[PDB]
Design a protein around this motif. Structure first.
Motif, PDB file in Angstrom:
ATOM      1  N   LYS A   1      35.195 -37.455 -78.256  1.00  0.00           N
ATOM      2  CA  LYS A   1      35.016 -36.520 -79.357  1.00  0.00           C
ATOM      3  C   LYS A   1      35.013 -35.107 -78.789  1.00  0.00           C
ATOM      4  N   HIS A   2      33.963 -34.780 -78.046  1.00  0.00           N
ATOM      5  CA  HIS A   2      33.855 -33.487 -77.384  1.00  0.00           C
ATOM      6  C   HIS A   2      34.233 -33.595 -75.908  1.00  0.00           C
ATOM      7  N   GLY A   3      33.528 -34.446 -75.169  1.00  0.00           N
ATOM      8  CA  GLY A   3      33.853 -34.665 -73.771  1.00  0.00           C
ATOM      9  C   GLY A   3      32.933 -33.981 -72.778  1.00  0.00           C
TER      10      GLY A   3
ATOM     11  N   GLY B   1      36.804 -25.765 -82.838  1.00  0.00           N
ATOM     12  CA  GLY B   1      36.074 -26.917 -83.338  1.00  0.00           C
ATOM     13  C   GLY B   1      34.564 -26.753 -83.337  1.00  0.00           C
ATOM     14  N   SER B   2      33.856 -27.876 -83.277  1.00  0.00           N
ATOM     15  CA  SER B   2      32.396 -27.879 -83.280  1.00  0.00           C
ATOM     16  C   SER B   2      31.828 -27.808 -81.869  1.00  0.00           C
ATOM     17  N   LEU B   3      32.709 -27.603 -80.894  1.00  0.00           N
ATOM     18  CA  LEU B   3      32.312 -27.492 -79.495  1.00  0.00           C
ATOM     19  C   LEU B   3      31.273 -26.398 -79.243  1.00  0.00           C
ATOM     20  N   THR B   4      30.214 -26.758 -78.520  1.00  0.00           N
ATOM     21  CA  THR B   4      29.173 -25.810 -78.136  1.00  0.00           C
ATOM     22  C   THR B   4      29.549 -25.057 -76.866  1.00  0.00           C
ATOM     23  N   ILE B   5      28.767 -24.039 -76.527  1.00  0.00           N
ATOM     24  CA  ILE B   5      29.016 -23.266 -75.317  1.00  0.00           C
ATOM     25  C   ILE B   5      27.869 -23.461 -74.329  1.00  0.00           C
TER      26      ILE B   5
ATOM     27  N   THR C   1      20.325 -39.613 -78.344  1.00  0.00           N
ATOM     28  CA  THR C   1      21.386 -38.701 -78.746  1.00  0.00           C
ATOM     29  C   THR C   1      22.755 -39.312 -78.474  1.00  0.00           C
ATOM     30  N   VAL C   2      23.797 -38.676 -78.997  1.00  0.00           N
ATOM     31  CA  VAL C   2      25.163 -39.132 -78.771  1.00  0.00           C
ATOM     32  C   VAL C   2      25.560 -38.829 -77.329  1.00  0.00           C
ATOM     33  N   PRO C   3      25.919 -39.872 -76.564  1.00  0.00           N
ATOM     34  CA  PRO C   3      26.264 -39.745 -75.143  1.00  0.00           C
ATOM     35  C   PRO C   3      27.539 -38.941 -74.916  1.00  0.00           C
ATOM     36  N   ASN C   4      27.722 -38.456 -73.687  1.00  0.00           N
ATOM     37  CA  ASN C   4      28.906 -37.689 -73.291  1.00  0.00           C
ATOM     38  C   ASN C   4      29.001 -36.351 -74.026  1.00  0.00           C
ATOM     39  N   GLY C   5      27.969 -36.038 -74.800  1.00  0.00           N
ATOM     40  CA  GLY C   5      27.886 -34.791 -75.534  1.00  0.00           C
ATOM     41  C   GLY C   5      27.258 -33.696 -74.695  1.00  0.00           C
ATOM     42  N   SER C   6      27.234 -32.484 -75.238  1.00  0.00           N
ATOM     43  CA  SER C   6      26.654 -31.341 -74.545  1.00  0.00           C
ATOM     44  C   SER C   6      25.138 -31.445 -74.550  1.00  0.00           C
ATOM     45  N   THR C   7      24.588 -31.905 -75.668  1.00  0.00           N
ATOM     46  CA  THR C   7      23.152 -32.115 -75.770  1.00  0.00           C
ATOM     47  C   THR C   7      22.691 -33.165 -74.762  1.00  0.00           C
ATOM     48  N   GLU C   8      23.546 -34.145 -74.482  1.00  0.00           N
ATOM     49  CA  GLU C   8      23.232 -35.170 -73.490  1.00  0.00           C
ATOM     50  C   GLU C   8      23.252 -34.612 -72.066  1.00  0.00           C
TER      51      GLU C   8
ATOM     52  N   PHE D   1      15.849 -37.855 -83.853  1.00  0.00           N
ATOM     53  CA  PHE D   1      17.216 -37.751 -83.341  1.00  0.00           C
ATOM     54  C   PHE D   1      17.477 -36.392 -82.692  1.00  0.00           C
ATOM     55  N   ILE D   2      18.171 -36.368 -81.561  1.00  0.00           N
ATOM     56  CA  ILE D   2      18.460 -35.094 -80.917  1.00  0.00           C
ATOM     57  C   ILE D   2      19.937 -34.759 -81.033  1.00  0.00           C
ATOM     58  N   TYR D   3      20.238 -33.637 -81.673  1.00  0.00           N
ATOM     59  CA  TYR D   3      21.629 -33.281 -81.900  1.00  0.00           C
ATOM     60  C   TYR D   3      21.817 -31.788 -82.064  1.00  0.00           C
ATOM     61  N   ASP D   4      23.024 -31.410 -82.451  1.00  0.00           N
ATOM     62  CA  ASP D   4      23.365 -30.023 -82.672  1.00  0.00           C
ATOM     63  C   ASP D   4      22.555 -29.414 -83.839  1.00  0.00           C
ATOM     64  N   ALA D   5      22.121 -28.167 -83.679  1.00  0.00           N
ATOM     65  CA  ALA D   5      21.262 -27.528 -84.671  1.00  0.00           C
ATOM     66  C   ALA D   5      21.970 -27.284 -86.004  1.00  0.00           C
TER      67      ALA D   5
HETATM   68  N1  JEG Z   1      28.393 -30.211 -80.007  1.00  0.00           N
HETATM   69  C1  JEG Z   1      27.941 -31.338 -79.267  1.00  0.00           C
HETATM   70  C2  JEG Z   1      28.811 -30.946 -78.019  1.00  0.00           C
HETATM   71  O1  JEG Z   1      28.975 -31.774 -77.086  1.00  0.00           O
HETATM   72  O2  JEG Z   1      29.351 -29.810 -77.950  1.00  0.00           O
HETATM   73  C3  JEG Z   1      28.054 -32.724 -79.867  1.00  0.00           C
HETATM   74  C4  JEG Z   1      26.573 -32.715 -80.113  1.00  0.00           C
HETATM   75  C5  JEG Z   1      25.614 -33.769 -79.916  1.00  0.00           C
HETATM   76  O3  JEG Z   1      26.007 -34.930 -79.625  1.00  0.00           O
HETATM   77  O4  JEG Z   1      24.383 -33.529 -80.037  1.00  0.00           O
HETATM   78  C6  JEG Z   1      26.453 -31.599 -79.120  1.00  0.00           C
END
Ligand code: JEG
Lengths: 39, 41, 359, 368, 107, 71
Positions: free
Chosen positions: D47-49, D73-77, D209-216, D253-257
């Motif tokens: 998804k994000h990577g 996209g929804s990609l964070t910095i 949280t969703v793995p392989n994500g930025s929050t992870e 749940f831990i995720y994007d704000a």
């Molecule tokens: N935006 C997210 C990222 O990886 O950039 C996806 C989200 C999450 O899984 O909490 C952070």
């Protein structure tokens, strides 16, 4: 400049619809969305 | 005198236990009815 | 924060409520105390100073800090020349080479971003309107009243009637009357006493209904319902809203033609510094004052008589001013990014933003 | 493009879809200002990577492979990404935040502790006047407090009436204040440690949280044990996480704000909410991935700040972002009958009784 | 909603209070605190009534023309209108409501 | 009477139909709703907000007579 060249429009002040204000002495003319009118 | 005691407990002022449960139920019913009457009003 | 040094020249030792000694740095700048405005050494300390110190810790570069001369953030204008316009303020200090970097809450906008580069935002913030809040202490003796006292006296008359009915029913004296008054605070005797008790309970419930009704007050829909409000939209002579002239807020309001009416309303009541406007809002000289939420929320936390309006508008950020031609902005933005990542900004915000309990 | 499904060319054929939304409209507005035609595609890998074993994936990987110049996209910095590639000015504030649902001292709050002291001093003066009119004084105070809870003669009668009025007023104001209560949450400063140490709370708190994500990645970066504990708690998607939250299979749940906030506003019935009343950790922004320092850069930044300057971001947020749970007009809900706050006040009530027991023991001590 | 756990804790507290009463048999101060706790309990009993009285959390999925559900249509909430009517002309006129019109077109 | 504000003109005015079309343009586009939202908006949508006992007493007196009968 004189307005005589048209469809002259006469109106009357009723709030909120019609709001009449004094022309700004510092600006010298009307500002923003306000439009000049004579009585 | 029994009905007087019951109605006395109903309104804000084996036998003892029953009178106690009746008093508690009367307090709950009175508070609920008064609060609900204020809220509804 | 800027404060004058002691005659010895040494900065005064202070500490946060957390028990942590507050770092301070030396900054030469204009003092508002003196009749003239010569730049003098003064101790400056705060979130920005701590950020600059931490940056100097991460990156080997040292720092010489000083306050801006004009006392304004930055603006683009020309006083005596119609032909060409020049920058003034800390921005002007950055473009004149007077400073290689500007560390302060300087709002990022397209107008300033042309000439100067902005580091990644250390603080995300926007503009909110701040108005005076008042604790509605009232009705104490007056909510003793609202029964109109006619109904309570009528309660006393009902007590007298119940005592007379008690005498008549018992026949079918003083101690009975005292018992009746005590109850206030044969078959028909008990009927009269029961009716008196029910009427008393009903009277208490009515007093509670009156109390509960009287506690709810001032209605919803406060003075500021958001960025867009009739009181805000139509500048009545009663309600006066203002902002600091020659600032980013000023440029923002003067930029849009929609906000030109608000600019006309603010232009007359505008102030040079935000402190005087805040003091005016506290003294109810100025009805409302629009400014940064970072400063405004902090002031609302500091003083409980001040509340900030909801529905935050103009989402923006604060960042360190840098020249585009200077190589330090890369590692500076990187360092701010790592600063947010590690959670240092969390501790810094927990530090300088107090959020008092208002005891 | 998809490898397993091939009509021809064996992976050469790509499926067409229609992308739209907040970030899409922002990308179109920006491309409108910058005035360049572009070709939109979707990332097939992840998804994000994130970076595993030294290799980037997703949009950033597509940028490293020059397959895409600018990623929107929804990609964070974050700190790691910003070094290799450039990021545009942040469009919206988003970061690691926790979504939770709350199931549920007001008694002493209504008195503000001043009413207690005032009533105590006034009851002391009234009991002194009644005493003028050892255990007898204790029975006098017992009578005063007896009137306070509503179970010479004239003063006691008036005192009883005032106590009754005070009691009714206290009841109405306590009910009103209990009804007017809100903002109740857990872990105001994230330092509560509930999520930190699972064994401190019995039963242990389940969070992931969703793995392989930025929050992870940030979660593994700041906290090791939190990453190890949330590893088994990882959710497939945000929808699966929300379902895990609703059905009771996950506590927090831990995720994007921003995502969590829209999910809160667009939530049917407004069941789930953000922690800290919109409190966010790491406070990241939403940018635009780009190439090496040479490029459009400052033009793109100026275009985004122009987008903020016109105010179209507010309208875009109104359409795509803002929810019906903002209309709540300050206080969100009642919390109804279930409180457990009374159980909290029970300790304060018990403490004065324990101190009175200490005074009884102290009186017994003076006797002996 | 008290879960019957709080009521049982109350009964257990009654047994504990009876045990403390037996054991005790300065207690007047404790009895006074007990009275205050009782008043707080009755006021809380009124508070439950006020709570059942409130019902302060409506969802309100559809508020107005600019509502989030209407502005941004979801597959869960299906909004429609009468075809070949003033609504069709109104929705097809604006490009902003054109998406909502596309959403209605199927429904 | 559910009256409304139009625009006064001279009889058989040619500018009538055009003005009508523009006014209806404001409602068709929905800009009339936004303009009305701007100028007509306001702050407050909403705000502000013994006989039986005597009857029971008379019933109690009748209860006294009835008790006298019952005694
Ligand atoms: N935006 C997210 C990222 O990886 O950039 C996806 C989200 C999450 O899984 O909490 C952070």
């Amino acid at each position: 400049m004189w307005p005589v060249f048209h469809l002259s429009i006469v109106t009357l002040e009723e709030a909120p619809f019609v709001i009449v204000e004094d022309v700004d002495p510092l600006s010298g003319t009307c500002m923003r969305n306000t439009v000049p009118c004579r009585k | 005198k029994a009905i007087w005691l019951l109605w006395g407990l109903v309104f804000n002022n084996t036998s003892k236990i029953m009178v106690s449960v009746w008093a508690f139920f009367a307090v709950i019913f009175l508070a609920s009815y008064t609060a609900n009457l204020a809220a509804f009003m | 924060y800027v404060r004058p040094t002691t005659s010895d020249g040494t900065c005064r030792e202070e500490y946060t409520i957390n028990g942590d000694p507050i770092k301070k740095v030396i900054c030469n700048g204009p003092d508002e105390t003196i009749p003239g405005r010569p730049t003098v050494p003064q101790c400056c300390y705060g979130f920005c100073v701590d950020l600059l110190i931490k940056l100097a810790r991460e990156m080997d570069f040292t720092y010489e800090v000083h306050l801006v001369a004009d006392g304004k953030f930055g603006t683009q204008e020309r006083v005596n020349n119609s032909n060409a316009a020049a920058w003034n303020g800390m921005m002007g200090e950055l473009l004149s080479g007077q400073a290689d970097m500007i560390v302060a809450p300087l709002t990022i906008n397209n107008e300033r971003a042309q000439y100067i580069e902005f580091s990644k935002p250390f603080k995300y913030q926007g503009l909110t309107i701040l108005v005076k809040k008042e604790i509605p202490r009232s009705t104490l003796d007056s909510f003793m009243q609202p029964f109109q006292s006619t109904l309570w006296l009528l309660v006393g008359l009902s007590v007298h009637v119940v005592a007379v009915m008690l005498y008549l029913l018992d026949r079918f004296l003083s101690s009975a009357m005292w018992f009746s008054w005590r109850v206030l605070l044969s078959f028909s005797a008990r009927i009269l006493g029961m009716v008196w008790a029910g009427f008393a309970m009903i009277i208490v419930a009515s007093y509670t209904a009156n109390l509960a009704a009287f506690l709810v007050l001032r209605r919803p829909e406060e003075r500021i319902t958001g960025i867009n409000d009739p009181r805000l939209r139509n500048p009545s002579d009663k309600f006066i809203y203002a902002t600091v002239k020659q600032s980013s807020v000023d440029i923002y309001f003067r930029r849009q033609v929609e906000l030109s009416t608000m600019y006309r309303h603010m232009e007359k009541h505008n102030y040079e510094s935000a402190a005087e406007a805040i003091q005016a809002v506290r003294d109810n000289k100025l009805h409302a004052f629009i400014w940064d939420s970072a400063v405004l929320e902090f002031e609302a936390s500091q003083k409980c008589d001040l509340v900030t309006t909801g529905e935050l508008f103009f989402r923006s950020g604060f960042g360190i001013g840098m020249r585009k031609d200077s190589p330090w902005k890369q590692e500076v933005s990187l360092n701010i990014l790592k600063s947010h990542e590690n959670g240092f900004m969390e501790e810094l915000d927990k530090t300088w933003v107090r959020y008092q309990e208002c005891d | 493009q998809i490898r397993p499904e091939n009509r021809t060319e064996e992976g050469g054929n790509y499926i067409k879809r229609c992308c739209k939304g907040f970030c899409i409209d922002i990308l179109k507005k920006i491309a409108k200002t910058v005035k360049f035609t572009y070709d939109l595609y979707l990332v097939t890998n992840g998804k994000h990577g994130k970076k595993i074993n030294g290799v980037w994936n997703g949009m950033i990987g597509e940028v490293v492979t020059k397959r895409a110049y600018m990623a929107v996209g929804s990609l964070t910095i974050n700190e790691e990404r910003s070094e290799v590639v450039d990021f545009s000015v942040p469009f919206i504030e988003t970061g690691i935040s926790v979504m939770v649902s709350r199931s549920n001292s007001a008694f002493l709050e209504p008195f503000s502790a001043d009413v207690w002291v005032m009533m105590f001093v006034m009851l002391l003066i009234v009991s002194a006047v009644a005493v003028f009119v050892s255990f007898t004084i204790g029975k006098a105070i017992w009578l005063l407090w007896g009137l306070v809870f509503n179970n010479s003669k004239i003063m006691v009668s008036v005192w009883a009436f005032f106590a009754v009025i005070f009691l009714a007023s206290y009841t109405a104001n306590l009910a009103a204040f209990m009804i007017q209560r809100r903002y109740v949450d857990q872990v105001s400063g994230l330092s509560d440690k509930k999520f930190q140490r699972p064994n401190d709370f019995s039963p242990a708190f389940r969070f992931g949280t969703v793995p392989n994500g930025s929050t992870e990645r940030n979660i593994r970066n700041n906290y090791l044990e939190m990453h190890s504990y949330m590893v088994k708690f990882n959710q497939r998607s945000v929808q699966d996480a929300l379902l895990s939250l609703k059905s009771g299979k996950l506590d927090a749940f831990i995720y994007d704000a921003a995502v969590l906030n829209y999910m809160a506003g667009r939530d049917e019935g407004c069941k789930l909410v953000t922690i800290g009343s919109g409190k966010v950790f790491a406070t990241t922004g939403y940018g635009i991935a780009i190439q090496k320092d040479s490029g459009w850069k400052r033009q793109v930044d100026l275009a985004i700040l122009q987008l903020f300057g016109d105010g179209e971001m507010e309208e875009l947020e109104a359409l795509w972002l803002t929810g019906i749970c903002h209309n709540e007009k300050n206080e969100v809900m009642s919390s109804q009958l279930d409180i457990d706050n009374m159980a909290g006040v029970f300790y304060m009530l018990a403490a004065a009784m324990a101190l009175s027991l200490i005074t009884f023991i102290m009186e017994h001590l003076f006797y002996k």
